[PDB]
């Protein structure tokens with residue numbers, strides 16, 4: 228088929244990049260990063276090791292508090308406030324790239340992260356009350 | 361609304377604290393904890409970094425072997441042996457705090473952790489046999 | 494009952510070992526591995542700590558990109574190409590051990606890891622299209 | 627070959643309905659219809675594509691509809707600037723956009 | 732955004748072959764097709780053809796099949812998502828019956844069914 232490679236679809240449309248997410252997901256913790264000798268290269272490599280797991284788990288932490296654990300494409304119950312981006316679907320997924328999309332959605336990325344957070348807290352509270360009978 | 365803050369409902373009832381679990385969940389790995397210089401403050405901070413991820417994953421490990429991965433309120437199939445606590449529901453969730461509850465359930469916390477563990481091993485074995493047709 | 498212990502069923506049949514997976518799952522991150530003093534034993538122990546979490550997460554990373562997050566026995570949609578092993582079920586689960594099974598499936602372990610990877614990427618894309626109505 | 631309405635008019639507040647049809651060569655159920663607002667001798671404007679999808683910024687009163695034999699363009703709630711000439715267009719994904727005859731509104 | 736300035740509106744006489752330019756700004760010139768449209772007075776507006784500033788692939792109507800040369804030169808990176816481009820247009824067995832206003836319009840989307848659709852137009856040029 229195609230298989231562009233790691234970040235190979237960085238310039239492709241959002242919909243086309245949304246079909247090769249495993250390509251980036253698997254390289255978020257591996258690479259080349261057995262004794263711990265504290266030389267100038269050893270201290271350098273140890274930090275490179277702790278830094279990878281740290282950043283990897285911070286993304287999985289947010290993915291957990293949203294109810295999206297172990298997911299690449301999860302859907303939510305947070306509606307799209309058009310003040311975030313009034314662009315239409317066809318001019319988003321068949322037009323923009325993820326890089327320029329993140330550039331314009333950047334202001335509201337912290338707002339959306341809160342709506343996904345409490346929506347998961349209330350949804351799990353709803354599921355518990357439904358299983359109380 | 362309310363929003364008491366991190367541990368803000370530590371003195372509230374168990375039911376009231378059971379509505380602000382995301383407030384504590386998100387601060388279990390972040391904070392303020394870019395080169396690795398091994399000075400007295402650098403070694404101190406590196407340990408602070410590894411210690412956070414270590415303790416964070418040990419809780420997620422137990423949460424995984426119970427079938428509660430990425431959950432804040434999951435329900436189980438382990439019935440409540442009244443020898444653990446004969447208190448009633450209304451005098452638990454509308455009365456006690458999580459601190460004093462953990463103080464009296466402390467003896468059986470290792471007993472319950474085993475019942476949730478093998479209940480998940482047997483449940484996944486049941487689901488495999490049900491999908492064998 | 495039985496309870497052979499950690500790796501206690503290493504020489505048992507695959508089906509018998511497939512009933513005590515929690516026994517190995519819980520010891521993949523604990524053990525005995527509070528200040529960080531960088532002595533010969535301190536540097537040695539710190540590496541032992543980072544090495545455990547690193548290897549633990551690499552297994553959970555693959556378990557995530559396969560849609561098996563927080564699972565001990567998950568079923569997939571990747572059929573068994575008989576060129577991997579033409580052995581029958583009864584002569585696999587009531588005969589072989591996991592050690593000698595991994596010895597003969599070793600060549601195709603990277604092939605299977607790719608089929609489980611893109612099967613999960615396409616399945617989550619299918620679930621999104623089904624919830625688009 | 628893609629015939630449009632001869633001409634038609636309305637009034638401020640009312641609505642219009644432009645037509646666009648043709649034979650099996652350029653219409654319809656296996657083709658897409660785009661509606662261009664085109665003042666004579668000026669920069670045109672894309673109003674609606676894919677039979678009924680509006681372009682970014684097009685007023686919601688513009689609406690497209692395609693039957694199995696003729697595409698339509700409704701222009702509800704008229705305004706002064708509506709005095710232009712409209713042209714339909716039939717296309718597929720990998721071909722050209724055969725324009726229409728024209729419609730003075 | 733996006734701008735497409737066109738060449739001058741000079742005139743020639745039959746038998747010749749004129750070149751029409753179209754300079755783009757405010758958008759990545761490679762990401763969208765470039766269409767050529769003709770609005771004659773003695774005919775309905777005609778789609779002449781589009782070309783790919785990225786892949787070089789061109790597609791013109793059979794009425795212009797062996798009479799028109801469409802060319803574009805490579806863009807110039809201005810920012811990460813902005814570039815300047817240019818598209819060219821020529822006619823072969825040219826007469827005076829091809830008189831009218833000529834426009835250049837870029838594609839609509841980068842993918843889908845309405846990829847090459849003329850969306851953003853130029854100010855046009857008067858001819859013979």
Ligand SMILES: *[C@@H]1O[C@H](CO)[C@@H](O[C@@H]2O[C@H](CO)[C@@H](O[C@@H]3O[C@H](CO[C@H]4O[C@H](CO)[C@@H](O)[C@H](O[C@H]5O[C@H](CO)[C@@H](O)[C@H](O)[C@@H]5O)[C@@H]4O)[C@@H](O)[C@H](O[C@H]4O[C@H](CO)[C@@H](O)[C@H](O)[C@@H]4O)[C@@H]3O)[C@H](O)[C@H]2NC(C)=O)[C@H](O)[C@H]1NC(C)=O
Nearest residue numbers: 238239719720762763764783785788790841842843844846
């Ligand atoms: C980098 O950025 C560029 C620019 O944006 C991207 O190039 C664009 O890619 C998209 C998607 O791949 C293209 O959209 C498609 O357009 C085709 C129309 O082209 C067809 O028609 C040509 C003329 O008739 C024909 O010659 C082509 O056939 C072959 O020949 C060329 C010769 O060069 C060859 O290059 C082709 O690859 C062909 O092998 C061609 O078929 C259209 O058919 C598509 O529609 C189909 O697919 C969509 C889904 O994608 C579907 O919705 C439709 O219903 C239909 O099934 C589709 O619209 C676009 O034309 C490209 N060019 C632009 C925009 O200028 C490039 O992909 C980016 N790459 C990366 C890695 O980021």
Ligand SMILES: *[C@@H]1O[C@H](CO)[C@@H](O)[C@H](O)[C@H]1NC(C)=O
Nearest residue numbers: 306307308309310311335338
């Ligand atoms: C959008 O967000 C603003 C504040 O960010 C809020 O006041 C408004 O009600 C929201 N509207 C919708 C439709 O969600």
Ligand SMILES: *[C@@H]1O[C@H](CO)[C@@H](O)[C@H](O)[C@H]1NC(C)=O
Nearest residue numbers: 318322323327682732839840
């Ligand atoms: C595609 O995205 C760019 C980003 O700025 C935007 O300018 C352009 O209008 C979009 N295309 C369409 C057809 O809306």
Ligand SMILES: *[C@@H]1O[C@H](CO)[C@@H](O)[C@H](O)[C@H]1NC(C)=O
Nearest residue numbers: 310311330331332333334335
């Ligand atoms: C984000 O905020 C900055 C603050 O100056 C503003 O300039 C910019 O336009 C904002 N962008 C969006 C998309 O809201």
Ligand SMILES: *[C@@H]1O[C@H](CO)[C@@H](O)[C@H](O)[C@H]1NC(C)=O
Nearest residue numbers: 439440441442443444468471
């Ligand atoms: C409660 O636990 C004890 C041992 O801890 C056990 O002997 C007893 O059967 C249990 N009873 C119930 C009702 O679960």
Ligand SMILES: *[C@@H]1O[C@H](CO)[C@@H](O)[C@H](O)[C@H]1NC(C)=O
Nearest residue numbers: 443444463464465466467468
């Ligand atoms: C827990 O064990 C200690 C051991 O001395 C005992 O004193 C205490 O009462 C026990 N508490 C409960 C709740 O069983």
Ligand SMILES: *[C@@H]1O[C@H](CO)[C@@H](O)[C@H](O)[C@H]1NC(C)=O
Nearest residue numbers: 572573574575576577601604
């Ligand atoms: C088995 O795998 C080989 C390559 O590894 C492939 O060519 C063949 O089609 C596969 N057969 C089946 C039945 O999956």
Ligand SMILES: *[C@@H]1O[C@H](CO)[C@@H](O)[C@H](O)[C@H]1NC(C)=O
Nearest residue numbers: 576577596597598599600601
């Ligand atoms: C694996 O590959 C080696 C390469 O020499 C080969 O000898 C061995 O037989 C192979 N085993 C299987 C099970 O394919």
Ligand SMILES: *[C@@H]1O[C@H](CO)[C@@H](O)[C@H](O)[C@H]1NC(C)=O
Nearest residue numbers: 797798799800801802819821
């Ligand atoms: C278009 O003009 C260029 C200019 O050099 C020429 O190389 C090319 O061959 C021409 N195209 C055709 C189809 O003749």
